RNA sequence: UGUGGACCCGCCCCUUGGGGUGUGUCCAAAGGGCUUUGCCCGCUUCCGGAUGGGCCCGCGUCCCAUCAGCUAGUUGGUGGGGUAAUGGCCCACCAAGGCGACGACGGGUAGCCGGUCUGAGAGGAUGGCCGGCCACAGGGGCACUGAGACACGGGCCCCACUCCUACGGGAGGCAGCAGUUAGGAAUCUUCCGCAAUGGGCGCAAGCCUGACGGAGCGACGCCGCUUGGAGGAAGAAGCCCUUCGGGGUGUAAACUCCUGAACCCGGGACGAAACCCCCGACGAGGGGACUGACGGUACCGGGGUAAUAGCGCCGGCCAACUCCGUGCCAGCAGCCGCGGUAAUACGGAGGGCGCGAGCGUUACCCGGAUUCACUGGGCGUAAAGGGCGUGUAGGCGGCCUGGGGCGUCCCAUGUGAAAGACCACGGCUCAACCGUGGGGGAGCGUGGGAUACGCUCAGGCUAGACGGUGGGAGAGGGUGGUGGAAUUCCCGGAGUAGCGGUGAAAUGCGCAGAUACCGGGAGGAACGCCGAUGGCGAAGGCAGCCACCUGGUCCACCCGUGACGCUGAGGCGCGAAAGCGUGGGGAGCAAACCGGAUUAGAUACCCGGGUAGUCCACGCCCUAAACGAUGCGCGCUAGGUCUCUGGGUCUCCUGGGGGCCGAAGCUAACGCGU
RNA sequence: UGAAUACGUUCCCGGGCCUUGUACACACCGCCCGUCACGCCAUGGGAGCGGGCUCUACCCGAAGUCGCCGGGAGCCUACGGGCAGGCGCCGAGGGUAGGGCCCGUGACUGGGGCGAAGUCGUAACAAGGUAGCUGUACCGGAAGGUGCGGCUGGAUCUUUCU
RNA sequence: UAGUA
RNA sequence: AUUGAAAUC
């Protein structure tokens, strides 16, 4: 069936990037879309777009890396080095605005779902609202 | 273990226990000797290691070691026990405090003096 | 007498017994002093205020499931009793309930908190002193008085104990302060004072107060301070090394100057101004008087003496090394380890390191220990996957929309006592100690608000699951039946001196004619070749051939239902071999046992026999290297190659299995790697 | 002066390179297991005498509150009632009988841990000299041995001990 | 046979 | 005595 659609997505992304795929699908949900636009806006993915594959909605995610590196092993640096689910269906996680974590002296980000909607941590700090600590990236 | 598991079961405080039943905490206990013997040690060592059996005010009866280079202890001696094992004498898990009760300090003992219970000599004074 | 209040009844508001009103009933009182006709201290009834309590409810509050079922005032009701008041609190009667894996009942342990210690934190540990609550007052009940008690220094009875006793009967209760004794490793003075603060009674003067405020003892803790300061040899002696020149203790001492802890004399507190008196008015305000335990202490001024140092350690961890003594002795040791004639590890001396009125030791708590892992761990071989399934509760849940707003989030507000911690400023010469002020804070209550996620309700959808039709391989299971090979035995023919067995033998069997050979028959057990690196099953496991009964699974079409899903504590079922019960069967094999060998022996390995057992029926047993030593499901992440079984356009593609090599990655490595 | 013999490398001894297995590293003159014997230590079962908690049933039941009586049977009276006193329920505790549990002691007794050089063998580690481990079952001074089935976590195309 | 690389 | 021992003369 699938137990965590979001966590699965972060993974699909995680997995694709380490073999340096140019693209991945992930079956489509509006909540998935909302997370994607953050990655997109915050510079981790080139972007997503909707497609229908074998007749059903997916989101084609376009990944984004670094320049071919110098010595032995020229594999590019990852743009997404670390994407990680936090609030799993087993143990749901909620920070209030006072407890919103700052991922990696700011160089990171924490997608975080609120009643004002899906937000980065700074977005949500600024809007002054906590919620379900979704995951974190950097 | 899954979280649900931890929620159902929790973790468990290992709390391993005393190396010294000198009972009631008790930093020391008073005892009366029963038997003063001499013991062959073990593992890779050899010597005639001195040690007493002690009847305890805690109701116990334990073998305790007699430190110092020579001693004044015989059957009904009445003594104070301090704990601290020997190691080369298996089953000896307490020491006798020298210089308390009928256990004299050690004679002609100049260096580590507060242990061995030997008062400051005035010979250099 | 009734301002008023109580009670029945009626009505009104209000909503649990809250407020109001109306007939009826019922209920008050105490006097005392004077600066005696005007005040003071009191009395009575009522409404209210403040303070202190009783009771009830939500959440939180240790260990054992080797405690799994508990319950008769038990759970509820109706009516009474009782209380200030609710209530099975108690009683009568009616009903048959109530509680439990979200851990009841039972056992063990324990006063709880503010906080304290520790930790980066989360957490752990803890509850002494001070503050809050509780409970107890030799052990057990009980009530009386009263605003309040079921009362530490009030009462009654039973118990144990101690004293009095004319043996009939009495008295008592330091877990108040001291002190005694006992237990113990261990814990203080039978001190001074009510001067202050506070409490009781009193109009007041005052009286009482082991609350208290002080002194005493104990390095028990924290803080401050002292044992001197400046000079002073290429360096006294003594002791320690030494390669015999030298090196060290060492500016250390001796010695010269200087300051002057202790001690002497002088002076000398704050803490104490109220109650009280007088004036005013017994008010406000003003004036006056008394009073200090600590104490002739603190502090100030003068004089003045060079005036205490110990304990631990020096192999590594860990900072500090040489010489004698000793010879697995004596001894050391926190762990690793030192000692057997050159010991930086033992004992000693010199020296050195570390602390210093202390230094060590032992005990205990947190730490390090991400070594119970929430933050923050794991299980192929290291400890660790349940022998396998079925599915109970429980956990977890696909895509779209709308409602509710329980989780979650935000704002406001209330609470979070004091002390403590923290920051400032301040008061004792500093500090320890102390004071004043400030700052936060989870958690919970109240009002408002948000709706992404989780929850729930109402619809939808088809990608998960299930189903339909068509096709496939299979030692998957159960029942009956049948086939050929071989062994053993019986019968016959033929035939003769041995066979058998071993490393070699021997036991054994053979002239009652065995072995070898041909023919017939009986009986049991197992199925050669195909046979595979193969197939099936959830495991255990499953192998001639046939028939019937039956489980699972795979593919194609993309037809149906509409999330119906995954997992699964307990439960139940299955579970090799051995073993057990009852009853059969019994060829071959074979624990035990009986023999023969071998051997130093040989309860063994080799040989000859041989019972249980292996086979069947039924019922038990429930284990294993029950092994891939790898739990189930789902998504994702290069390929090559071998193979079993489907489908398709058939050199290849596309499913589902079985294998190997190997991308990324993983692993301590070996390895693992759709 | 002056031989004989060497096919051959299976065996004995010493050695060289590759590989394998290893529980050895003092390095096979290695390691190591169990009984028995000796000595310290803690512990388990244990009939009977003793010490307590607890449960049920039956009986006796102080103090006290409460309930009834309170009389021609006593004291007070304004005759309304009060007090003494009596009876009763409950009740601290106690007694009899029966189960469940803890504490101690406990003759006889099961093993276990540890201890510089005791005894018998040689199980295991190399194919450990019969590959080893294993569930079970029988047997034997001792390690063990055999039977049935399983596992690979086995190498390989005459004789013990240090 | 015990300690001992 | 041998080797530091245990054993052993």
Curated annotation (Swiss-Prot), chain A:
Q: Which UniProt keywords apply?
A: Ribonucleoprotein, Ribosomal protein, RNA-binding, rRNA-binding
| Classification via InterPro entries | Ribosomal_uS8, Ribosomal_uS8_CS, Ribosomal_uS8_sf
Biological process (GO) annotations?
Answer: translation
Give me the Gene Ontology terms describing cellular component.
ribonucleoprotein complex; ribosome
Gene Ontology MF terms? rRNA binding; structural constituent of ribosome
Q: List the disulfide bonds.
A: none
Role played: One of the primary rRNA binding proteins, it binds directly to 16S rRNA where it helps nucleate assembly of the platform of the 30S subunit central domain. The combined cluster of proteins S8, S12 and S17 appears to hold together the shoulder and platform of the 30S subunit.
In the record, the note on similarity to other proteins reads:
Belongs to the universal ribosomal protein uS8 family.
Binding partners and assembly? Part of the 30S ribosomal subunit. Contacts proteins S2, S5 and S12.
Q: What is this protein called?
A: Small ribosomal subunit protein uS8
UniProtKB/Swiss-Prot annotation, chain B:
Which keywords accompany this UniProt record?
A: Methylation, Ribonucleoprotein, Ribosomal protein, RNA-binding, rRNA-binding, tRNA-binding
Under CDD domains, the record lists: Ribosomal_S12
GO biological process terms, alphabetically, are:
translation
Decide whether keyword Ribonucleoprotein is in the record: yes
One term of GO molecular function: rRNA binding
Q: Where is this region: Disordered?
A: 105-125
Q: Where is the composition biased (Basic residues)?
A: 108-119
3-methylthioaspartic acid: residues carrying this PTM = 88
* PTM (free text): The methythiolated Asp-88 contacts a modifed residue of the 16S rRNA close to the decoding center, and might be important for decoding center assembly.
Q: What InterPro entries does the record tag this protein with?
A: NA-bd_OB-fold, Ribosomal_uS12, Ribosomal_uS12_bac
Looking up SUPFAM superfamilies in the UniProt record yields: Nucleic acid-binding proteins (SSF50249)
The UniProt entry, under Pfam families, shows: Ribosom_S12_S23
The reply on keyword Electron transport is no
Offer a single GO CC term for the protein: small ribosomal subunit
What HAMAP family does the entry give? Answer: Ribosomal_uS12_B
Q: Can you state the subunit structure given in the record? A: Part of the 30S ribosomal subunit. Contacts proteins S8 and S17. Interacts with IF1 in the 30S initiation complex.
Question: Per its record, how is this protein called by name?
Answer: Small ribosomal subunit protein uS12
What organism is this sequence from? Thermus thermophilus (strain ATCC 27634 / DSM 579 / HB8)
Organism lineage string = Bacteria, Thermotogati, Deinococcota, Deinococci, Thermales
Q: Which gene encodes it?
A: rpsL
